[PDB]
Point group: D2
Chain length 30, copies 4
């Protein structure tokens, strides 16, 4: 239902944040 869709959208948002953090950490290290 609607909550299952909301969970999928949140899980995608978590992945987008994890990519941003990985890019940030590389910039700090690099």
């Amino acid at each position: 239902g609607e909550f299952a869709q909301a969970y999928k959208e949140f899980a995608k948002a978590y992945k987008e944040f994890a990519y941003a953090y990985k890019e940030f950490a590389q910039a700090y290290k690099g």
Copy 2:
């Protein structure tokens, strides 16, 4: 410089994630 720009992009990514969490919490509470 590059690191300052990387920090700005990371800060924007954090805002986008915080909005996704808010939307997720609203969907759970609704």
Copy 3:
């Protein structure tokens, strides 16, 4: 059930992470 409790624990984890980000941002600015 268990999921409702897991949501409460995750919400607490989010608040802790949001407070860590706030401290990090102040350290970047300061």
Copy 4:
């Protein structure tokens, strides 16, 4: 040096949040 320490504390907070998200996702799947 103080910013370097703040980065380390933020990196630990990110790991703590990633562990919470993993536990939350397991509870949703279970």
